Amino acid sequence: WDSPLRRVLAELNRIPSSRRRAARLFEWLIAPMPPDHFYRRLWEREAVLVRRQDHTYYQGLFSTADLDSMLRNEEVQFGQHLDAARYINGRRETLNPPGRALPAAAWSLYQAGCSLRLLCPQAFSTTVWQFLAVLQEQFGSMAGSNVYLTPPNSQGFAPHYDDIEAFVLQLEGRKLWRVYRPRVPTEELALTSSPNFSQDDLGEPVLQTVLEPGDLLYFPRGFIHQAECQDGVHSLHLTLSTYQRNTWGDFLEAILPLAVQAAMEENVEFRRGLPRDFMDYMGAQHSDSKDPRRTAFMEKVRVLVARLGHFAPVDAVADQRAKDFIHDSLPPVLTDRERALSVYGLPIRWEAGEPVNVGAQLTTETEVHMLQDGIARLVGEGGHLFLYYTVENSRVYHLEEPKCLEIYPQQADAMELLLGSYPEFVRVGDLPCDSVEDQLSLATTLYDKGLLLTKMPLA
């Protein structure tokens, strides 16, 4: 009943800082490899195998039994939640019948040699949820997962590369894996998933191993892989994914239109007219021209383009990405203490004809801090100030709209503090506000939204 996973979770529950919980979990995930080594040398560079020598390492995360109960007791649908996939004679097939995925249909597909893939394990499992919710906070990017159940003597999927950084957690059974370095420069750190490939398209694997429960296999986006079950045992694995479209380039994409707009507003060289006759020497038809006006036109473009670095609103684009990350995030998983110190743990309930325990209200003496460190982001838009938060997100990606509340100017400084000093307690009364009305209303608003905790329960 006790496993390394159950123990690290009980451990997380005693670590007061969410930032520390996230670092600690990632350490556990790749142990005994040091995170710092992993991030400096292997992340986005190399495939990595961790031979755990401990089949029990992940016990409690997710199992085939969990999947079986899910099919029975939740409304799992083919396509939306569950795929059945085959790869035979070099062809990827998808065999999803429309509608509900009852056990009866899923298991006979499994029997007929189909892999079963659950697209959103975290919507149906509170442990996978916690796992991803904690880890997203140290990635700074959505952590997704799929679960892959593959029957004996079959391959579910064609060789391909994906568009994310992938961590394969081997859960039950055994699976033979082949992972390949990017085949060409343009495939290194690929932007989008590849097509299903064939074996004639593959070089030599950089890594070829039979994974066993507890093991971990990590590889970067762009690394081709494929996997098969041999002998007679099935395989179950959870692949943790992250870093979809979170590149330097994706940052620049958003920076550049703003940068040119600002350059045009604030500097007349960007507002000067084009030559009246540039169409005489620029264009496909003039690609070979020796008109020196051509060479001057190119040079000017490269100089103006260079100058855009000065006009780039880097912090505003940082905050838009933070906002998008807030929207993408899974809602937080509270420790017992966080629960107990927050609105969620207020003991107010309905007891024999009435609500019992109306709690205290907060006062200037109540000591406070943010519920956790990765649930909220303050963003300026349209000369307004909006606190975007995760505490009401669905476990399903973007099922709810982005959730936010307005922070008035009177209250911005005090909100900034709160977010910059987690997890240190601050007396409400010492919050930088003009008045004690603003002190009290920011804290109260933050508390009722489930964004703030108190050093002691209000009741």
Partner: peptide, 11 residues
């Protein structure tokens, strides 16, 4: 044919 890893949890 069909699709591989669905990071988003969705089709």
């Amino acid at each position: 044919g069909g699709g591989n890893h669905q990071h988003i949890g969705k089709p």
